[PDB]
Structures are given as structure tokens and as C-alpha cells.
Amino acid sequence: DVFLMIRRHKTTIFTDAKESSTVFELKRIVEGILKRPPDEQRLYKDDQLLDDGKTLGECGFTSQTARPQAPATVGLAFRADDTFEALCIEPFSSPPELPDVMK
Amino acid sequence: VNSREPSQVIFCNRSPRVVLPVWLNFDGEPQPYPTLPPGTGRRIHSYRGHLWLFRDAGTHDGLLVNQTELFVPSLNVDGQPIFANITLPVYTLKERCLQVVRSLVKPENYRRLDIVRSLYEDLEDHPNVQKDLERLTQE
Amino acid sequence: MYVKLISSDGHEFIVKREHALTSGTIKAMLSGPGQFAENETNEVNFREIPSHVLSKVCMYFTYKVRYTNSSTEIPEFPIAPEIALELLMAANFLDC
Amino acid sequence: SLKPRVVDFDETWNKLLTTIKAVVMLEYVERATWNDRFSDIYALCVAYPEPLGERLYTETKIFLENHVRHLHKRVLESEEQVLVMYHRYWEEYSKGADYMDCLYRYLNTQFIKKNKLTEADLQYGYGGVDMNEPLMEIGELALDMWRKLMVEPLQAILIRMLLREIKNDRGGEDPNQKVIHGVINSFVHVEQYKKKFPLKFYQEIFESPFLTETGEYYKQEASNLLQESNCSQYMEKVLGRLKDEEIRCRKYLHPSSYTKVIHECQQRMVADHLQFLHAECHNIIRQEKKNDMANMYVLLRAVSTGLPHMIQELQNHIHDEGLRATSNLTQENMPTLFVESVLEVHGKFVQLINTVLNGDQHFMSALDKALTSVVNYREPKSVCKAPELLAKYCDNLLKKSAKGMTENEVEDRLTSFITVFKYIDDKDVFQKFYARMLAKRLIHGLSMSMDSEEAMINKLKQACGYEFTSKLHRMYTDMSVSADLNNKFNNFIKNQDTVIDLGISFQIYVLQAGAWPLTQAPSSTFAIPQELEKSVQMFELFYSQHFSGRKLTWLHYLCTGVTTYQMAVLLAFNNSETVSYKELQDSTQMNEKELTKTIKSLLDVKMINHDSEKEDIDAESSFSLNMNFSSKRTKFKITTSMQKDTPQEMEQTRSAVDEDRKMYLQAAIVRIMKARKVLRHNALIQEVISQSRARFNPSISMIKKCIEVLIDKQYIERSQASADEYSYV
Amino acid sequence: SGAGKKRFEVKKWNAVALWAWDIVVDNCAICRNHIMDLCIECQANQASATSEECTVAWGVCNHAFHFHCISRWLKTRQVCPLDNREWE
Amino acid sequence: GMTEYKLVVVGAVGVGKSALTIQLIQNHFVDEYDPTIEDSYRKQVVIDGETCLLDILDTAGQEEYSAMRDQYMRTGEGFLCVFAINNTKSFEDIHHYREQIKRVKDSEDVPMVLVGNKSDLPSRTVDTKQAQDLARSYGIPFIETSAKTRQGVDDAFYTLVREIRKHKEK
């Protein structure tokens, strides 16, 4: 029951999946939310894309690393206009300096 | 009350934090007991039909056993001791976050924090055993 | 089925309706005026909720939904000290 | 950054007031603006210089004050349309208040904390009752303010309009249900405070005027029905109004008032004209119109005091009907028709209690407590009726009855016989009367089957119990067991050490002497021919040692093989001209002084002068030829007779019942004083009834005779007189 | 002979007989019932033995007596319930 | 001064705690000693060449739990849980006395010697193997004693002192 996080530019998705699930099933589940055909869309592990044949177990993740407290982040890119675009993670805002509590 | 004790219970804790149990006698005054190290278990006896309360040793937080607040021993069945497992309750963010603030903030330095006025009273409201058992008398 | 949350910066978060329904403020916002559901119950905008704190709240919602009434062990929820005050303020505002 | 800020409160409230007014009365509001107003309320409650929760609450309270009065003027201005106008505004306000509570969710939490601190200080100081304690939620405050509109003189108008409009049951105007239900439900919907009674307002403002008005209306309606409708058609009118009342109250009234309105309806048309209904109570029961009797029961079920009246009337009809059939059957000398009459009355009336009375075990009690008196009549002094007739009924279905044969039907008829057996009270009389009659059957072996009567003891196994059937179980076992001893000697007679036939053709039915009711040894007698008893004496000595504890006493009461007290022929002659007592001679040692007339009369049918035969002479006999019948031949010389005749003899058996009844009178007390050492005058009475009502009837008339016996057999003086003195020690 | 024969023949003879224990023990003292039947007295001493034969056995006085009816006698009284006492 | 050892004799009432105590110090058997007397007795003895004073507390009275008796029991350095071999109930109660000693001393390792008294009687109901196994499960020595004949009375007390000494060198 690994919990993932799909982030594109500013959009963030909170979903859950099983290790027996596949990248094709993940694409199917994000299709119903993003209203985009799943053939073009592709996923990333911040280093290389994930093939459809490979299942969720063999690409890493696992329950120990992927927990509800600290879910893993999975990139996503669109492949519509015949040209790939660089992964724009766009990280969240930096937290402010900590108050007097630093001791 | 005074009754025979043909029963024994096992105190096994699953929570990461240290557990300090307090047991209610016939008088009703819970007393401190040696702390249970995390991820351990001890074989112990008990009065039949007497409440047990499990609390944190350090900051006195709430702990749940058998998905219940109170623990009542029962008569032994076919030579099998009864097992009690302690789990961390599902704290709310307001309650969970105050625990982080309370540990970090010196108890005489609340007023220097720049937060809302209402949260000052809640932050100063340290958990207390007499308060805890007051909300269990009803029903 | 899926609600939409928007932070002050502009980040967009999509979580399950049941996951987001554990907060009284969000429940009241969703169950307010007359409902048509064609373009309603979505894009819930929070004007003073930063992106990191909103993400932490979403992680709460997922953890609480998953770990409710569970007989297994309950690991503690980790809270960063630098985000503690803002997260506490957001929890107080949202009535978690 | 949710840190406290500075707010002028003179601009956010003005913007918020427009949104709040749109939320009320269900006006369109932008979805984006709805979410934005949540932050404005939060900002006001955390203002940096000082919290503005008090200012926000007071301003919101003022707005609801003016809005309610604005709607109040419009409703009061319009006349004849108050109900329709009130319903339209109430629905908009009811939904608007709920939405405002969600918007003011944050402010509600602050009120709860503030209220709890002051709620703990009310005992020490009221402070004007906590300065008119703020409502826990803003939505609850809105309902309170709408209540003041109800408190306004609109309450008098709304009640008057509602009562008049609901009073259209006379006609068929059919007022709209939605307006009625919405207005009535508003009385209870406004009150949702659980500290007080939620229905307290509704009962005081609407239930009390409605109940009084409903009762008065049906008081006039009940009177008008009597002047035209007869008692028979009055019931049909009652059923229709009661059925329509439930439908009418279902649509318009709150569920909590369903039973109360029906109870008031029943107490007016019924239990106020109960004298009129009771007048026809006797007529309908005597008549066969079962359809109208159903309407009697339905109305009278609700009223508690009405049922006892019809208990007695039904009992009287059963009592009179049973006596007429039983009394007309007298002098018919037929016992099998008595059981048929009782079962027919029970069979016909048990259907009536079911199909047109719907159970009512209380009414079923009337059948049981009335039919029991029919069985024991006792008024005519003839054949004692109930004890003897029941006893003389089972034998006809269990004896030979060659002419009357109904195979596979006696089992059914005997099972149906139990419907009258438990209604009798003199069960002791029946028990011993049946025992003596039963014992006469197996001895002569005229029962039609050996397994047929097995059902009888089984039928009495549970009705009478083991204590009653402890003796009766011994009748069956002996006859079955006696089939084992006779052939045991047959095997033993073939295994004699001396190997001598002895010329024995013998059979024995061993009795019990503890349960067999036949009398034994009325006199000495014990006269037995010598040439026959010698073989029988060998039987006695060679059988006793087999058990080694029993010495059977030989009797000749029911000897056969009937050939009772055989003359042994001899070779002497006498004279017999007329009557009897012709100087009887050569009489051996029998004790037959008073038994001459009973025994000598056996042969007068066959032989008189004792001068015939005596032709052939031989050492033993000639046996030349047989020709006509021989051996048992005619057999028609029996003198045991049927029913034993002798109208004096069975009187001792009934006296023996009284003697046995007297045994229990001084013996049932043993258990009474064994547990209750200290006795009270009322305690002894009915104590025997509580334990022996089924066995016999412990009437107080004969109880006075029992206590006389208790006076004797005691020597401890009874000093006190507070209770009964018949207790020993 | 008008209607008859020499006769003088012997046929089978059957009848009924009554058996007894031959020792009445004068109906004991208080039970005054048949010795075969269960005695009322056996509800107090509670000596469960020979349920078939409640009273017919050897007595305490080395003589034919009730098994338990006379057992209570030693506890309370001294007279002999067998001789010179009838009815009462 | 010379070394003192505070040892405590506990057990069920009637097992012989007083008889064993009197026999050790006064060298005679006293039967039916008053069961309600609880007192401390002292004797100077030599064990293994070392002279020491024994402070023997002979316990008695009703069961009672408070700070005063807990502190009074806490002073004990060694404990003698004595049972009667002809009293099965006394042997069954042995476990109950052991736990409380562990609570008041706040340790699982307390010098303690199991004593089976009344060995001279022929009505034994607890076999030797039963007591040896219980003592072995507790990691303690077991001694059979008879205050009437003084058999093993000195052995029981001397072993407990050795148990205290072996505890202190750890």
C-alpha cells in the first residue's frame, strides 16, 4: 500500500497504489483526473523514465520508503506537441527562519 | 475492592515513546510505577476487574490499549494469559503539534512566541492525570 | 470524488473528498450554498495557507484516513520544528 | 501567515453583511465569495489590539432582530393567508439559519470555551444569569429569535386558523397537507435545546388546545349517532371514524402524539355510553349473529373496565346450554352419550373464541370455568352421573364389543376423551372405579387386544402423573410378566429329577396384593378337592424356592376351568321338589353356611333333582361315545353376571373411596406442617387446594370434618389463640 | 338323561394367587402401609440401599423389621412397634 | 563494630518461623509459641571463620501494605521463606512472599533461601523434588529443617549469610 505523489509544475496529486500495480495502471488512474490520454504521458524517478512493462515493485519505492507521513515524489511530463519538455519540479516555498525556540 | 486475583496480564507496548502505567486501586489514587522500555514486555499479575491507565513518562500523553482507554482484567481461560498491546492514539494536528511546541519551548517562555491569543491558554494547558480521569467518570 | 485545493502562492493540490472531509472548515465550505456540482465542490481556495503547510495537512489527511481504527502499530507523525508554528496555526484555523 | 493583524471592523462587517443577507431567504451568492468570508470571520476573532468576537456577535444579533420583525410585519399585514405566508417564510429562514451556523463555525468554538468558564460560576454569582448566556451556536440563536415571532399575537391567530382548518372532517374540503405539516412541525423544530424538554413548547401551545377541542367535537358527534342509528349500526359508524382518525392524525400531527389523540377519541364515543352497549350485550350473545360480536370485542378491548362485563354473560350462555343437553339426556341409560354432549359444546364454542374473538386467553378462561360445572351436576340423585359415567365410557371402547367394532378409531376416540377428563373434580372416585373395572377384564381375558389399553395408561401418564398412575402402571406389568412365570414352570416340569408327569395342566396369573383391588379371603373356606390339589401343591413348593422369598396364598374367588366349587359328582342321591334347603347332606369342610344360595343356584339351569345319569358302571368311566357337546359344552352357566348387579355391593366401594379420602385428609397435612411449623388460620385453608385441587375438591364444608380428627392424637396444649389451634406442636 | 352325559372328566384348572413376604412386622409404627410399598419414613434417615426393597430386610434388633422405619426408633423412642400394638 | 546481617524470616502462619528462630538462638525447641509476637532477635555466630552478628526479625501478624512495613521490610538483607512440608497451602503461598520481597528491595536478585520445616513429621505432603525444582527456578538454595530436632536449622541461616556475602562480592 505505497502512497505516491505526482507533481507537475504546480499541480500535485495524492493517490495510493499497491506494489502489484503497474505504471500502466498508474497512468490510467491519473488519466481520470488530468483528462489527458495515457499514451503520451510518462513518469520519472528524477533520473530516468519508467517503462510500462516494469511493475511497481522492481523500480524501487516499497512500503518502507513510501509511507503516508513522507510519501515519495513521482514526476510527470506531457508528450502532446511532439517535443518533450524538461521536468519543472517547482519546489515549495522555503520555510521562514525559526523563532527563539532554537535554544 | 478486595477480591481474589486468579488472573494475570501482559504489558506490551508498541509506541516508540516510554510508557509509564498508573493503576487505580480501591481508593482511586493512581500511583507511579517503573517505566517500561520501548518494544518490550513484562509478565504481571493484577486484581480482577480493576482499571489500568497507561501514560507517557515524560510529557504525560494519552495512550490507547485494545482500542480502549481503560483496561479491565478478566478471568483466565484454558490456561492462556491475556495479552494487552499499547498503541499510539491518532492525535489531532492541534494536539499533536502542541506536543512538539511544548517540548521545544521552555515552560516559562510561552508569552514571547508570536501566535494567536487563544493558543496561549491551550499551550500552557499541560496534560494532568487528575484532569484525564475527570473526563472518564461520566457514562 | 476529488476536491481541489489552492494555496496562496498558486500551488494546486488534489486529494480525495473523504480525505479532505475530516476538517470542519472544509466540510462547511463544501456544504454551503445551493449545489449544482457541474463546476462546484472544487477549487477550494485558501488565501492564507502556504504550500508546505498545506502539503503537511494533506499528509495528515492521508495518514489519518489510512491509520484509523487500525489494530496495528501507529508510528508517530513527524513535524518539522521550523514549520511547527505555521502548522499549528493552520490546524487551529481548519479545526482539525 | 495567520499571525494577528489589525482590522477596523467598519469595512469587513459591511462587506460581510451583504453576503449574510444573501445567505438568508435563499438568494444566489457567488461560490468564491462564500469561501472568502470564512477568512474574514477568523481575522476578526484574532485582532491584535483586542479580540472582536463580542462586537461581531452583537452585530449579528441585531441583524437577526430586524430581519425577523421585517417578516413579522408582512405576515401580520396580510389576512386570510397567514398559514400560506408563514410556511413560505419559515422554510427560507430554517435553511438560512443552518447555513449561517457553518459560516460562523469558528466563533462557536470561542463561545463554548467562554460559556464553560461562566457555567462553573453560576452558583457563586448569576451576573444576571451570565448576562443572558450566549447561544452555543449562531444557528440556535436564530431559531430563538424566530420563536419570539411565534410568541407574538400570531400564536393566537395560527392556533385559531389551524383548529378551524383541521376541523374540516365534517366535509371533504381536503386542506393541503404540506402547509399543515410544515407549520405544526415548526413548533417542535424551533426548540432543539436538550437541557429542557424538546417537546415542552409543542405540548403547551398546540397539544392542549387540540385535545380539548377534539374531545368536545366528538361529544356532540356521539350523541347525534344514537338518536338515529340502532345499537347494531352504531358499531359500524364507530369503526369508520376511528380508522379515519388514525389516517387524519398521521398526516397532520407529530409522531409523538399518535397514541394520545386516539385515547381521547376512544374515551368519548366509548366508556361514556357503555350503559347503552351493555343493554344489547345479553341479546347478541343469545343470538347467533357472530359478525356483530366482533365489533363488541374491538371497542371493548381498549377500555379496561368493559371486558369483565362480557366475561360473565358468555359464561351464563355456556352454563345454560350445557345443562339443557345434559338434563334432557336423563333416564336414557346410556353412558356414551354424556361424553358426546360435553365435547360438542366445547368443540362448537372453541371455534367462536378463535374466529370471531381473536384468541383472548382471558375469554378462553370463561369456557374452562363454565364447562367444569356442567360435568358435575349433583342436583339429581341418580347414578351419581359424572364419576360413574366417565368410568363406564372407556370400557365400551376397550372390551370385546363384537357388534360395535371400529378398528383404528378407538385410538382417536380415546385421545378425544381427555377433553372431558380433566374437567372433573372427583378424580379419586374415577381412579379406583376404573381400577376395579379394569382388573375384571384381564382376569377373564375378554380384552380385545393386549396393546390397545397401553395407550390409556400412556394418556394418563401426563394428565394424572406418576403418583396417580403408580398403581395403574402395575396392572399392565403384571399381565406381561405373568406370561413369563407360567412357561417357566413348563420348562421346569420337563426337567424333573423324578421324571414323573403328575398329570398337570395348570396355569397361574400371579397378582400383586398391593395394587389389585379385588377382595381376598372373605371367610375361611379354603376347601379344595384332594385329587387335584396334590398336583397343585407340588407347584407351590417347587416354585417358591425359585424366588426363595414368596409364599403364594391360594384363592378361589375367580377360579375357572366356570366350574366353581365343583360337586365332585360322588355316588349319592338326594331329593329336590320345590324352593331350596332340601336337607343338604355330605357337605365337606367348606365354610359355605351363608353361601348356599349363591352357589347352589348355579346348577338349577342345568340340573334340579340330582337323579339323572348314573347308568354306566366302571372302575373310572365308560367313555363309550361323545355324540353331543362335551368338556366345556354349553359354558352358559356362568353366574358372575354383568356389572356385578347387587345394588348394595358397590356402595362399599364408594365408602372405601371416602375411607381412602379420609386417609389423605389426615396425611396431606403431614407435608403442610413439615414445612410450615407455625400456622395461621388463613394459611391452612386453601393450602390443600394449592396442592390437591386436581386430586379432589377440598370444600370448606368438609374441611370442618377433617379438623375434628386433628383434635385427637395430640397432647400439647395450645395456649395462644391468635391463629388456628389445629397445628401440632 | 334329558340332556347330559356320564361326564366325570378332569380338565385344565387355572386361577389367581396372592403372594406376600409373610412378615407383616405389624405395619411398623407410623407408616402403617404394606411392607412392599415404599415407606414414608425413608425421607429422613436417607440411607440409600436396596431401592427395590425399602423395608423388607433384617432389622436393627436382630429380628425381622423394617430397614429404616425402626432405624429412627432408636433415635427417639424405645418401645417395640411389633408386639401388643394394633391400629392406633 | 563487627559486621551485622539483617535477615528476615517470612512464611505462612504456623509453619514454624518462631520455632526456628528460638531454636537457632536459644538452642531449644519451643512449641506453640504465641503466633502474634513479631520481634527482632540478635545472636553472635561464626561462619567460615568470620564472626558476625545476626539480626533476626521473626515476622507475624496480619497482611498489611503501607510505607512503614515496606520500609521495615526493606531493611532486610536476606530473607527466609519457610514452608511446612505437611502443609501444601504453605508451599503454594511461597511464591506470594517472594514477589513482595522483590518489590520492596526493587531487585530480582535478593539473597533468599527456601526452607522446608517440620521434616521430623511423617505427614509430608510436599515431596523433596517439588521444593528443589521451585528453588532452582528461583535460583536459590533449598534446605530441609526441623526446629524440634535442630536438623539443618543452622544450615539454613548460615547459607543465607553466605548468599548475602556472595551477593555483596558481585
Ligand SMILES: Nc1nc2c(ncn2[C@@H]2O[C@H](COP(=O)(O)OP(=O)(O)O)[C@@H](O)[C@H]2O)c(=O)[nH]1
Ligand atoms: N514437629 C515439628 N513441629 C513444629 C516445628 N516447628 C514448628 N512446629 C509446630 O508448629 C506450631 C506453630 O509454629 P510457629 O513457630 O508458632 O509458627 P509461626 O511462628 O507462625 O511461623 C507449634 O505448635 C509447633 O509445635 C518442627 O520443626 N517440627
Ligand SMILES: [Zn+2]
Ligand atoms: Zn414402617
Ligand SMILES: [Zn+2]
Ligand atoms: Zn423408605
